Design a protein around this nucleic acid. Structure first.
Lengths: 109, 83, 97, 95, 109, 95, 95, 83, 97, 83
DNA sequence: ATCCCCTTGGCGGTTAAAACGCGGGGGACAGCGCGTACGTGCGTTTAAGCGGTGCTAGAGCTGTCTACGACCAATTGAGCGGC
DNA sequence: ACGTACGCGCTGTCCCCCGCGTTTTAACCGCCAAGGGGATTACTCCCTAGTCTCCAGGCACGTGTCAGATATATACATCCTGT
């Protein structure tokens, strides 16, 4: 007579797990007790960041007329965005290379 | 009870202030009377339509809903009175 | 001598003062008299709600100020700053009435 | 079979199917996304632990992560994140 | 003996009423059948519209440092946006006035 | 005795407080939002009815309004609206 | 065979022979006239719907459509149409 | 396969005949490019509506029916092909 | 001397003849190529009825006729017999784009 | 109660003394403006963080403990105020 | 699931479509004043605005009833398809 | 009533565009293969309308209270004036 197992992520209306995020908060040893708003809130901010960066990744791929996302598109997508750059200044992307950022005086006249 | 000359009820300074809101700097003297006329014909259309709405309703008082409704069927919808 | 501004800058002061303002520039009582007069021209002994008079007042307000911004476009078309009523006849024709 | 190496696989594909139905995913880009989610989760969880010790709190609820998002994520993303997180916690309270 | 009441707006995570719009599409007399996703789709669309315009109106109210929204704030909000201008070109706003629009020749010098 | 007149009161108030908690309301602005939501609703509804007539479907689904919002709503506004409705209907079918 | 595809060809031909027995008709002009019949019919039907719902009328009667004719049809065309429709409905009620 | 310029297929003399229908008696050279531009804008809007119809029709060939439907929606209702 | 007409007279002859003309004024095949071109800018491998090519042809030419009659109204308002692009631009602005 | 422009309260000779501790021989007159600007930027970051700490703690007075927490977060750990 | 048809794909001849150069020749337009006409600065007045009072018209809600009209099975006929 | 400012008539003056006119070329015409999709038809499932019952959010009402409506005194913007 138990209720149907319905997901907490859909209770959030979201896709990143309340379950996995709550589990890595509990077993990441960050506090003795963890409030219920904590994993849904943090899954929400990860889903916002993920949706934003894959939006920019998809636009970067279609700008290069290509279909499948590549870390070149990801690295391009990160350092077009100022607040993403301020978020990820000290992080290096695998196989991403460097976006073309050429200083002006070394360019020919 | 009868009224005769309410075209001049919309005064010349009222017309000048209207054109101030529309961003007109200089308003020539021929403008006021024919703008009274085009305001007249605009209200002839709008009020004829709205009064036709009222007499469709078997009501006797014109309502603001019919004014905005007769506005909206002329592609001139208004916001702020129950539309 | 009393101070006098040049012809035009008082008009532009009125301009700027009135897009910063929102107030309905038409006097309430003669507008209500006019709407009763035009309605009486068609069908008799006809009463108007005050809300109807006011609503029709911003209606006519916006209709004419749209006509004046359009005729200002017609005037800067015509290399002019003083509009003349053929601008309004043009605007009526090319809007389609 | 081998032991399961847990990841964020199906989640990144379904969020992409929400945001761009037609584009594809490479394994390198997917590893980048896994390491991104690992990094951001680690930063926010660590700062939540910091606020737990700092206010002598054994409890970490959405308010401390709202504090942490206001700390770490700058400005536009911060208030955006607070908005959908507040919508998420309200739908959580409404189940 | 009965399931507890949950509104369809809470099921979709919207706060415009799904049932009200469904009723008003039934009695707006637009089709004899209406798909179930149609009114919640429309309510979400108006949610995006109203959220967009209330961002704009609240921001304008802060810009004129007034606490309460006014139709002048609304009329600045619509008229300072291009796609809302196309969406509401033929719309009259009560006490909203006109957007501040001075032509270049009207300026002195 | 009075008859109740229906409006869009609490919904516009709640969505404003969700987007701006510290910004107030005037009643004439509230009438402007009432007329806005009514106007856009009737635009979409009439266009949907015309589509149902036009493709001879006796129904209006989510797909009809999907069509109708690239019809009336422009571009990025339309695509954001399509995305909002798509996630909304996936949450609705999940509930 | 084919399904019967409906058009106003015969009745416009009937009124054509009624008012000009000696004249002819072309296929392009007949398509124009069918589009004209459809256009004016849908305009009047739409205005009749609006009058029905503004008065909360579940039906569109001769009063409703008559009013809609005064809205749509201008001036002397409107009153002539009123005269024609009034004569027609008096003949109809005379059976 | 793909095509990169058929806008110029609506040619300069063809635009000249089109303005000859409108009564335009002298046409400077600057008009024509903007006419093809606004031709692209209008037909882009119409075909956006039309392909949105067509994809909603779950078909792959455009008919004139959805064409006159889109011209109805945009407000330039066409006689001759309805029904 | 070979015979030559004054400017505008051939233009006005074209005016009279093509207000008298009722046929389509554009070459059919490049218009078909252009609508296919804009179609593959939107959806891939898309097909058209020939009647749809006719319909967009006649709608396009009539819509352009509307823009140009507005252009004559604007140009005679601008006191010019030679039109400029700003006439068409202002007509698009007033028409409610 | 409210203040407008106290940012010059950090005077120019205070900046000169700071650069003397920083070992700058010659300080241009252009320098003092961006020093005030970057000092505004850094304090804006630090006080944003500190206000967020205090508002988390449901208080109305900023403690130096929250200040040194903000200096822990941003990576300028300071010794000597009970951290 | 199919079928069959109008579009798609490909092919050959031609002359108008166009197209570009020459050359005439029609055109926009600044500008320098001039005519004049509102723009603006006041004073005057008077009627709109504001406040208060009595009347009641009809707006709108409630009850009654009945006038009116979609549905449906059926019969048929006049317009749709086709030549 | 004073008065600056705008509308503009005309006319040179560069100046761009219309029109004639031969040439070139690709649509027009007219002509065949065909197949894919438009369009039609059988099926059975997806889907939604609609009643009874029950509850719960949303609007009328009241009110009371602080953001705003109103009021008063300087500073600067501006806009004319004076050297």
């Amino acid at each position: 007579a138990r209720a149907k197992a319905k997901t907490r992520s859909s209770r959030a209306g979201l896709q990143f797990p309340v379950g996995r995020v709550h589990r890595l908060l509990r077993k990441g040893n960050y506090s003795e007790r963890v409030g219920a708003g904590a994993p849904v809130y943090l899954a929400a901010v990860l889903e916002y960041l993920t949706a934003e960066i894959l939006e920019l990744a998809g636009n970067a791929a279609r700008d290069n007329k290509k279909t499948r996302i590549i870390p070149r598109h990801l690295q391009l997508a990160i350092r077009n965005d100022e607040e993403l750059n301020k978020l990820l200044g000290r992080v290096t992307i695998a196989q991403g290379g460097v976006l073309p950022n050429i200083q002006a005086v070394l360019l020919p006249k | 009870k009868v009224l005769r000359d309410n075209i001049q009820g919309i005064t010349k300074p009222a017309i000048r202030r209207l054109a101030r809101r529309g961003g007109v700097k200089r308003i020539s003297g021929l403008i006021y009377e024919e703008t009274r006329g085009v305001l007249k014909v605009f209200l002839e259309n709008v009020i004829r339509d709205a009064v036709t709405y009222t007499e469709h309703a078997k009501r006797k008082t014109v309502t603001a809903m019919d004014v905005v409704y007769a506005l909206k069927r002329q592609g001139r919808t208004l916001y702020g009175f129950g539309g | 001598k009393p101070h006098r501004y040049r012809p035009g800058t008082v008009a532009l002061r009125e301009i700027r003062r009135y897009q910063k303002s929102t107030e309905l520039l038409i006097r309430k009582l003669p507008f209500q008299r006019l709407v009763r007069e035009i309605a009486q021209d068609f069908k008799t002994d006809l009463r108007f709600q005050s809300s109807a008079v006011m609503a029709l007042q911003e209606a006519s307000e916006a209709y004419l100020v749209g006509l004046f911004e359009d005729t200002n476009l017609a005037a800067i078309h015509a290399k002019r700053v003083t509009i003349m009523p053929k601008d309004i006849q043009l605007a009526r024709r090319i809007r389609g009435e | 079979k081998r032991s399961r190496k847990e990841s964020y696989s199906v989640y990144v594909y379904k969020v992409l199917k929400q945001v761009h139905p037609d584009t594809g995913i490479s394994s390198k880009a997917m590893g980048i996304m896994n390491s991104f989610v690992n990094d951001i989760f680690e930063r926010i969880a660590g700062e939540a632990s910091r606020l737990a010790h700092y206010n002598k709190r054994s409890t970490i609820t959405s308010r401390e992560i709202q504090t942490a998002v206001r700390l770490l994520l700058p400005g536009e993303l911060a208030k955006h994140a607070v908005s959908e997180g507040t919508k998420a916690v309200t739908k959580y309270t409404s189940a």
